[PDB]
Amino acid sequence: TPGSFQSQHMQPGVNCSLKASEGQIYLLDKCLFFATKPCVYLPYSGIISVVTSRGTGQSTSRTFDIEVQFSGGSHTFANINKDEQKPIEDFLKGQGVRVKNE
Amino acid sequence: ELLIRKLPFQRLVREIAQDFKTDLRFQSAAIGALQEASEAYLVGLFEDTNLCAIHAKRVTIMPKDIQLARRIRGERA
Amino acid sequence: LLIRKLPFQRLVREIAQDFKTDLRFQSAAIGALQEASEAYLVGLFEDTNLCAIHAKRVTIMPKDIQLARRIRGER
Amino acid sequence: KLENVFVRPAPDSKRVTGTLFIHQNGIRYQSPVRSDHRVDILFSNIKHLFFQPCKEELMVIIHCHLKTPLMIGKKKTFDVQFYREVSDDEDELEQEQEERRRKALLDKEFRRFAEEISEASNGLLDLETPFRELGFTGVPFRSSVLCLPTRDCLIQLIDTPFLVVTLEEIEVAHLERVQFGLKNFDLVFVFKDFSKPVVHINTIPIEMLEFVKQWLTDVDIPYSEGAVNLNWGTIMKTIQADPYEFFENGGWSFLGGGESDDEESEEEESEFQVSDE
Amino acid sequence: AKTRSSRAGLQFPVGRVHRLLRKGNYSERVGAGAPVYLAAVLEYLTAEILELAGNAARDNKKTRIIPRHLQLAIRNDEELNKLLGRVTIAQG
Amino acid sequence: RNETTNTEEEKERLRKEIQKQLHEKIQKEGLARFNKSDAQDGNENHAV
Amino acid sequence: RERACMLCGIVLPGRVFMQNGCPNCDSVLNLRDSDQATVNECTSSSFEGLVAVGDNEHSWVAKWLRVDRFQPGLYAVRVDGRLPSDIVAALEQYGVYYRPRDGSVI
Amino acid sequence: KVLRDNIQGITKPAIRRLARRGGVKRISGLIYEETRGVLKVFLENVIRDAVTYTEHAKRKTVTAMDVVYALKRQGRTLYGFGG
Amino acid sequence: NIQGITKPAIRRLARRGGVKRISGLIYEETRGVLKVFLENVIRDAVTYTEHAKRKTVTAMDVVYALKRQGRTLYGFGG
Amino acid sequence: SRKESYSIYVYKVLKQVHPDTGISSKAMGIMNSFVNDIFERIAGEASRLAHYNKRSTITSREIQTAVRLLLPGELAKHAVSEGTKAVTKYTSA
DNA sequence: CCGTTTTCGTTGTTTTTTTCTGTCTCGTGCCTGGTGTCTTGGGTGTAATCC
Ligand SMILES: [Zn+2]
């Protein structure tokens, strides 16, 4: 079931795009789960670091991107609302995941 | 750091300004502020364009994406 | 106006019931609220239709609304 | 002959350049790689012959719209397009001038060849060119494209699938989504042959509405406007079932209802154009 | 010509505009031709709008101007709609 | 501008008059194309 | 990746020159405020003779290399390439004389 | 008396009619709820300001001018109801 | 002077905006958009300057012209 | 007191422009809102200019340049011409 | 702040018929599969500097 994660909007997940596919990311107690073709399951034990990009320089990007690095590659989740950045970072730090902010 | 070369932007600004009043002078800080604002605007526009392109299930941004973003913002009628 | 005048009145009162208990309303306040709401929604449906046509579609879907509200700068 | 020409639809899955030949009763496209990939088009079967120069395009075009459909490879088509592509601070400005020379060269050669096709037809085929200044943007299929009027047709030839609407075959035009401060509208063409499916052109910018209305009037096409996208699958099947009863009850003339028929208004304040205090 | 509107050939009230500019907390002092200039501009703009509203009401065979005709006039004029792009018209 | 909008709108009254003459023309040319005898000879289409 | 600023003779990474400019020549070159072409025309990655200076005031080498009025750091005895004619004229406008460090002029 | 869950008074035809006036031909079934939420968030943002004005005037009735100022603050200027 | 905005500069601006692939007409489209933006902003700034009875365009004119558009800029004396 | 509105002036202007046309009450409400809104915009921008230039008086130059900022090209040109004409003739008279 | 006028907001009841829905078949558009050809990597191989 959904974990202890609650978005700024009190929602159990966040809207994001993985490549050209729009969908929902769920931060569950043991894993990150993206529920939209293609479905992506990422256990926290397999995650090396999460990199968050909020504009990579000048101009405030209203929507930020999350790159999840793991032993088999990286997944970039794009178009996440910036208000959801702090709740996601605090939850991932709470789960013992290394968060890097460019 | 600013991604446009300074002299081309200054020449463009002077070319544009010369169509409203001849013999105008610009403080260097005015050109710097204009360049900062123009790049910030263009980066925000490119972010919206990227969002539109990803919405259409593509990777390549196209002029129709720019026109749609500018229309939705309320910039083009 | 396409929405009626009494369900909308009840909705407005229900929403207003959170900010201050037992608030009276005025002749042209509910009417103005309905005009503004319908104008806003029509503009939003215009943008949604534009996005849906952009996606080569004719059916508007919730992700088009979300994209429109994202580009407008809505939270 | 015209050399180094690509054909659409392609007879094989491989894009190959060919040579187009003028013969006594038609044209022949012939691939150099295989003799069996010939495309023969009779002058009697061409309905419309279009030429389109590189005015903004990376390509030059000779398009044949057909009366009867042909079987090119595995595809039935009414349209056969013959084309070639131009594509391959003062130095970059000079490179644009060199591209403008290459445009003008291919434009002159392909226009001349399309006129020579018209001459070889003994006056059966007129050469049409698009009026670019009268063009408007719209979505007939899945992409936004520039729709171009010609003398006798509304065309789009740059992207597949092609649009070719003959103006004389139109019975009525309907403008859908037209109402109070709307962002865009749709245009629907109904044909005189009710068995033919209606053609939709979507998202025409509202800025072009008054221009499209003027253009339809200048071409003697009746139009009507509506706030709602009327279904034509329904409308046509009812009209096909009894076309006589349809016209007996007012056809589309009654549906038009141009008369505003509005007298209720919103009352009036005491009419007094006099300074008060 | 007693009224200041007459001395300027205007129809809008110069005196009321002067009073509103003064009793409005905009600046310590007010000129003598600022109210005149502003009244002239306002009268010109209202005439500009009423011309197109009359045109639209005459295209609908109507003698009275209603919010519909004002909406049509504004949204059909390139410059007025640019001026009034963020304005909602009730019953328009 | 007022005399040009009057002129442009009188050209638009001619535009509307043409559009009305086109709707009446097509109505007459639909009643002439389809006769009550063709309606009587209704062809029922069956799945082949 | 390191480049040698032609005017003052300092050697720093080319990306450092682009992002921050020359700490000494910025009063006359505006290297940070200059595009990549101007950075290359005033900072060259092809050089010879790495020099480390600790005390500009008392080092006879710094006086001999005319770098005793600059920031201590990495410097090059010889730098490939010279300043362009337009930049030379711009510096001459400021009243500063440019002596090439290319070695071909002595 | 307290009002409970009156959002469903924005029935399917109102939203459909609003879409048709907006030029929408085909409407997905998830739209109606989407729209409802959007409208809620709008009204809550406008009303919170109108009420803020009403309470500051030490009044107990929400007037039309309060709504007009609340809209004007968001760049939603409304002609017809005063101004 | 509008050709001074080279293709690499537009590419750089798109990369900082997160754009992965770029069409060939994007450059001309962007040049047109930038020209419109700059035209409006410089027109407002020159209006401010003429009103102040100056022949030099200051940073205050640009800052007020951006505040006029709604593009408030910090760090230039505002 | 008797509420102030620009209704009679709009009637005067209308009869000047369209003698055989009438206005509804709601259209007059809209017109009054428009006039008030434009006055507010122009006065606020004039005050902003006066404060920007350390001045304590609103003269016709501030109003003119406010009109230059607010109105688009042709509208600004015609309105500036109209205002200067009216101010010139009021001064002359 | 206090007294006045009288509009239009709140209250309730009856009737109409457009809108919502249960049900069916068909199709068109969403999704899976096959394929293009470009930008780029990883490697061989020829050839080399360095001490
Ligand atoms: Zn240096």
Side-chain angles (χ1 to χ4, degrees), chain A, chain B, chain C, chain D residues 1-253 256-258, chain E, chain F, chain G, chain H, chain I, chain J:
Chain A
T1 54
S4 72
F5 179 74
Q6 296 175 352
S7 73
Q8 184 69 15
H9 301 296
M10 300 292 294
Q11 298 193 330
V14 183
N15 289 322
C16 67
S17 59
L18 179 68
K19 305 179 178 181
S21 64
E22 298 182 350
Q24 297 177 349
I25 191 161
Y26 296 89
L27 298 175
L28 312 172
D29 303 340
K30 298 188 180 185
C31 55
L32 181 166
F33 189 83
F34 180 71
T36 59
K37 172 120 242 142
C39 288
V40 180
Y41 168 79
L42 293 169
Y44 294 137
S45 63
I47 292 167
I48 298 172
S49 53
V50 178
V51 184
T52 63
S53 58
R54 60 183 75 179
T56 67
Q58 292 179 354
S59 182
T60 290
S61 189
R62 45 253 225 75
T63 55
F64 84 108
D65 307 335
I66 297 179
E67 189 186 4
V68 185
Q69 299 182 342
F70 58 97
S71 57
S74 70
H75 285 307
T76 313
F77 300 95
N79 200 33
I80 301 176
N81 189 11
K82 186 178 179 184
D83 302 330
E84 302 292 358
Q85 184 176 354
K86 296 180 181 177
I88 293 170
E89 286 191 24
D90 293 342
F91 185 83
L92 289 174
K93 288 166 193 156
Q95 298 304 329
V97 181
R98 294 180 181 187
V99 184
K100 294 178 182 170
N101 298 352
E102 285 189 341
Chain B
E1 53 92 18
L2 295 147
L3 307 163
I4 300 173
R5 293 182 183 174
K6 183 178 179 180
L7 273 174
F9 187 89
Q10 202 189 169
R11 272 194 265 102
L12 170 62
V13 166
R14 301 178 176 278
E15 187 216 340
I16 290 179
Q18 173 184 50
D19 283 287
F20 307 128
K21 176 143 162 304
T22 44
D23 178 38
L24 276 183
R25 290 194 154 196
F26 288 85
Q27 297 186 346
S28 60
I31 304 289
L34 272 162
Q35 195 165 184
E36 296 286 347
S38 301
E39 278 185 325
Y41 167 86
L42 285 171
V43 172
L45 183 59
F46 275 133
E47 282 140 2
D48 296 332
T49 295
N50 200 0
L51 291 180
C52 303
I54 288 147
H55 173 258
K57 264 162 191 93
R58 279 186 274 103
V59 181
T60 312
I61 71 163
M62 274 176 214
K64 47 175 283 172
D65 299 322
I66 287 180
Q67 301 171 339
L68 177 80
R70 294 234 308 152
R71 206 174 190 308
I72 289 164
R73 285 183 171 201
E75 300 191 358
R76 182 73 65 140
Chain C
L1 297 170
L2 298 167
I3 321 172
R4 217 219 205 167
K5 200 186 177 182
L6 187 57
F8 187 86
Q9 199 173 177
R10 292 190 296 271
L11 172 61
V12 164
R13 293 175 184 289
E14 190 199 351
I15 289 177
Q17 206 152 61
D18 310 329
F19 302 130
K20 166 160 157 46
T21 300
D22 186 74
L23 255 177
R24 321 167 188 180
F25 276 98
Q26 196 254 1
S27 160
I30 308 293
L33 275 165
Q34 194 171 350
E35 301 271 11
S37 296
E38 304 197 13
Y40 168 79
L41 284 166
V42 174
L44 182 67
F45 280 125
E46 267 154 34
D47 286 338
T48 310
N49 210 24
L50 282 187
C51 303
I53 286 167
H54 189 65
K56 328 178 169 299
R57 312 295 180 89
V58 296
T59 292
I60 63 159
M61 272 172 38
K63 66 182 181 180
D64 312 315
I65 291 191
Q66 291 168 342
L67 176 72
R69 298 192 57 237
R70 218 133 39 218
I71 290 171
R72 290 174 140 187
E74 296 179 359
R75 272 75 192 264
Chain D
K1 66 172 177 167
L2 186 68
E3 297 184 356
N4 304 336
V5 173
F6 300 101
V7 66
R8 281 165 185 188
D12 200 359
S13 60
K14 47 184 62 179
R15 176 177 172 174
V16 181
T17 52
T19 304
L20 186 62
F21 295 96
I22 306 180
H23 292 298
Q24 305 180 7
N25 58 348
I27 61 182
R28 173 170 287 167
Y29 174 86
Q30 183 180 0
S31 183
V33 181
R34 288 181 177 162
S35 51
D36 302 354
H37 301 317
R38 64 181 179 185
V39 181
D40 297 351
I41 305 170
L42 301 178
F43 298 140
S44 61
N45 193 48
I46 297 167
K47 191 177 170 197
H48 304 302
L49 178 69
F50 310 103
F51 167 73
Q52 176 168 356
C54 306
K55 284 183 176 183
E56 299 175 302
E57 300 84 343
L58 301 176
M59 69 190 296
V60 65
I61 292 163
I62 298 170
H63 189 93
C64 300
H65 185 67
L66 306 176
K67 298 178 185 169
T68 65
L70 285 179
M71 14 73 170
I72 299 179
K74 294 181 182 176
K75 293 185 178 182
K76 185 184 175 204
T77 189
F78 287 94
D79 296 289
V80 190
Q81 189 192 29
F82 298 112
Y83 75 104
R84 185 175 176 181
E85 305 194 73
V86 171
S87 57
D88 274 316
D89 310 345
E90 184 168 35
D91 298 339
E92 182 167 22
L93 190 148
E94 178 173 301
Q95 287 160 11
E96 186 186 314
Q97 292 175 343
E98 188 61 21
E99 287 171 18
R100 288 170 179 270
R101 293 168 191 141
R102 189 160 66 252
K103 287 175 175 174
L105 176 62
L106 297 190
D107 295 338
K108 183 176 179 179
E109 182 163 33
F110 281 57
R111 186 182 287 283
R112 177 175 173 170
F113 200 76
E115 288 186 329
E116 287 172 353
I117 291 169
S118 173
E119 289 176 358
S121 82
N122 301 317
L124 288 169
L125 301 175
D126 288 348
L127 181 63
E128 294 188 39
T129 301
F131 303 114
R132 198 177 211 86
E133 297 175 11
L134 299 177
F136 63 89
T137 62
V139 184
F141 305 103
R142 292 181 179 91
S143 52
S144 180
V145 296
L146 185 69
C147 300
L148 294 163
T150 56
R151 191 184 65 189
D152 306 325
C153 305
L154 183 56
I155 63 164
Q156 171 274 347
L157 308 180
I158 301 171
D159 299 330
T160 57
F162 311 122
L163 185 71
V164 182
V165 179
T166 307
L167 301 169
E168 187 181 11
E169 294 188 341
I170 298 171
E171 186 84 351
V172 65
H174 187 63
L175 300 95
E176 299 183 338
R177 302 163 57 190
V178 178
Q179 45 202 319
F180 118 88
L182 234 277
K183 277 194 160 212
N184 279 178
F185 71 98
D186 305 321
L187 175 66
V188 187
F189 293 118
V190 184
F191 298 101
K192 306 192 168 155
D193 179 2
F194 300 153
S195 79
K196 191 175 175 193
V198 300
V199 165
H200 294 268
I201 306 183
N202 297 356
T203 209
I204 313 181
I206 199 72
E207 300 175 5
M208 298 293 175
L209 176 69
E210 275 39 51
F211 173 79
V212 170
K213 287 179 175 179
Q214 182 167 356
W215 169 64
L216 291 169
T217 307
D218 296 343
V219 179
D220 301 327
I221 295 163
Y223 73 82
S224 55
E225 65 188 9
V228 183
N229 305 55
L230 302 182
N231 186 227
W232 301 98
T234 309
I235 291 179
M236 299 319 286
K237 284 175 188 168
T238 305
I239 298 171
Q240 286 173 4
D242 193 341
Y244 176 78
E245 179 178 20
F246 169 64
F247 286 108
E248 182 181 1
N249 305 344
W252 281 292
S253 61
Chain E
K2 319 269 170 162
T3 42
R4 292 191 260 176
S5 298
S6 47
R7 294 161 171 157
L10 287 172
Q11 275 96 5
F12 280 5
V14 170
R16 179 182 288 177
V17 168
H18 197 39
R19 167 179 62 93
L20 298 161
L21 269 177
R22 191 155 46 262
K23 280 73 176 175
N25 205 289
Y26 299 102
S27 179
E28 306 294 336
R29 309 168 68 85
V30 184
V36 168
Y37 195 86
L38 183 50
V41 176
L42 287 180
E43 179 188 314
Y44 162 69
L45 288 160
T46 67
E48 190 74 58
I49 297 169
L50 294 173
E51 179 78 51
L52 315 168
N55 287 353
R58 184 201 290 141
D59 284 340
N60 287 264
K61 306 177 266 192
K62 230 149 143 71
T63 309
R64 279 175 198 158
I65 299 170
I66 59 189
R68 188 65 162 125
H69 309 138
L70 298 178
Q71 179 79 282
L72 292 181
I74 285 167
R75 300 278 99 89
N76 275 309
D77 182 9
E78 192 186 21
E79 301 315 346
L80 267 181
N81 174 58
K82 194 202 281 213
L83 191 66
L84 307 185
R86 284 301 280 251
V87 160
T88 290
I89 286 163
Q91 289 303 282
Chain F
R1 175 58 170 199
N2 65 334
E3 56 182 66
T4 87
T5 62
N6 292 344
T7 305
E8 294 153 41
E9 189 249 340
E10 282 174 23
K11 291 177 180 184
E12 205 188 308
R13 292 179 200 182
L14 177 60
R15 194 186 297 172
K16 294 166 207 307
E17 174 57 26
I18 291 161
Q19 286 295 326
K20 190 175 184 178
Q21 290 177 351
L22 296 173
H23 276 287
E24 287 182 19
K25 183 181 175 188
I26 280 159
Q27 182 63 9
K28 288 169 186 163
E29 293 179 353
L31 290 169
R33 284 173 198 174
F34 301 103
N35 284 310
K36 195 167 186 162
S37 54
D38 305 352
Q40 294 173 0
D41 301 347
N43 183 28
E44 299 179 1
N45 300 349
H46 306 288
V48 181
Chain G
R1 304 199 312 270
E2 287 171 353
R3 309 192 67 97
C5 174
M6 295 195 185
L7 189 54
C8 69
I10 211 170
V11 189
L12 286 170
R15 87 189 210 286
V16 169
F17 273 111
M18 184 56 195
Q19 292 148 349
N20 294 330
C22 170
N24 284 120
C25 289
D26 202 81
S27 67
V28 291
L29 276 183
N30 306 331
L31 285 193
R32 181 177 65 83
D33 289 345
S34 75
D35 48 358
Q36 194 84 51
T38 313
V39 172
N40 289 15
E41 282 307 310
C42 312
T43 80
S44 175
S45 64
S46 179
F47 61 94
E48 182 265 333
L50 174 55
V51 174
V53 176
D55 206 330
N56 297 113
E57 171 179 356
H58 300 88
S59 169
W60 174 94
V61 164
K63 185 188 81 174
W64 186 257
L65 290 195
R66 319 170 181 266
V67 287
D68 60 356
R69 321 288 289 271
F70 294 145
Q71 189 69 254
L74 303 180
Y75 289 73
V77 174
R78 200 189 60 73
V79 176
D80 300 300
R82 256 209 297 284
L83 285 180
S85 57
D86 75 317
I87 299 193
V88 160
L91 291 185
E92 290 199 353
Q93 284 262 326
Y94 314 143
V96 189
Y97 164 68
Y98 157 64
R99 196 171 186 268
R101 311 180 191 280
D102 61 341
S104 191
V105 177
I106 185 163
Chain H
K1 206 262 179 181
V2 65
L3 283 171
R4 178 179 65 247
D5 198 72
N6 264 7
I7 183 62
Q8 310 271 336
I10 313 300
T11 45
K12 187 182 65 63
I15 313 170
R16 182 176 304 271
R17 292 199 288 276
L18 295 157
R20 299 281 182 255
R21 179 160 300 172
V24 181
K25 171 192 177 55
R26 286 175 53 181
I27 313 169
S28 168
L30 261 168
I31 288 293
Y32 309 106
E33 272 297 319
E34 189 71 32
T35 301
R36 285 204 190 91
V38 160
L39 177 53
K40 207 151 169 285
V41 177
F42 180 75
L43 289 158
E44 261 156 20
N45 292 342
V46 182
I47 297 177
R48 191 211 298 111
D49 276 9
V51 171
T52 296
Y53 283 111
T54 296
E55 184 178 1
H56 174 268
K58 296 213 273 181
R59 282 195 267 95
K60 305 213 181 83
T61 315
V62 172
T63 54
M65 281 306 218
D66 293 349
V67 180
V68 165
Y69 301 151
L71 283 160
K72 184 214 161 174
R73 163 176 156 72
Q74 283 104 40
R76 291 283 189 267
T77 304
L78 172 77
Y79 292 177
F81 285 101
Chain I
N1 282 153
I2 190 59
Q3 297 291 353
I5 311 305
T6 50
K7 164 179 173 176
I10 297 174
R11 283 175 89 64
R12 287 193 285 268
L13 290 163
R15 295 286 190 264
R16 177 170 295 173
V19 169
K20 188 174 182 186
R21 199 168 180 274
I22 294 156
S23 184
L25 295 174
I26 288 299
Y27 309 126
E28 267 300 288
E29 185 70 29
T30 297
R31 293 185 179 113
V33 171
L34 176 65
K35 202 195 176 60
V36 169
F37 175 72
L38 281 174
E39 275 170 16
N40 294 322
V41 171
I42 298 165
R43 186 192 304 120
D44 275 10
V46 172
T47 293
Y48 278 117
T49 293
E50 301 176 70
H51 178 274
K53 286 163 185 161
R54 276 186 279 102
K55 314 271 189 223
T56 195
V57 182
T58 51
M60 272 315 109
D61 297 345
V62 184
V63 165
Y64 298 148
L66 292 160
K67 194 222 191 193
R68 164 91 191 101
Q69 321 305 331
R71 318 308 300 256
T72 300
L73 183 63
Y74 285 1
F76 279 92
Chain J
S1 71
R2 301 181 63 85
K3 280 292 298 183
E4 290 157 18
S5 86
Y6 305 90
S7 304
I8 47 165
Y9 308 128
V10 173
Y11 277 152
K12 279 189 196 81
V13 172
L14 170 76
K15 292 324 175 176
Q16 183 178 2
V17 176
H18 276 113
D20 286 321
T21 318
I23 291 189
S24 304
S25 285
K26 284 176 165 189
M28 200 65 77
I30 295 170
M31 278 310 303
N32 279 311
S33 300
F34 164 80
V35 177
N36 289 306
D37 180 45
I38 298 294
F39 180 105
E40 293 179 353
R41 294 187 198 184
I42 294 174
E45 188 67 80
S47 183
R48 201 162 307 129
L49 284 158
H51 292 357
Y52 285 160
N53 296 135
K54 284 184 300 303
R55 304 281 281 266
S56 65
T57 180
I58 292 172
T59 73
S60 80
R61 200 183 204 247
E62 281 82 2
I63 300 278
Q64 169 165 97
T65 72
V67 169
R68 266 182 222 275
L69 294 147
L70 276 296
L71 307 195
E74 193 70 71
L75 280 195
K77 203 186 306 151
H78 292 303
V80 162
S81 297
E82 292 301 326
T84 64
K85 185 203 182 264
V87 172
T88 299
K89 175 232 181 183
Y90 167 77
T91 300
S92 67

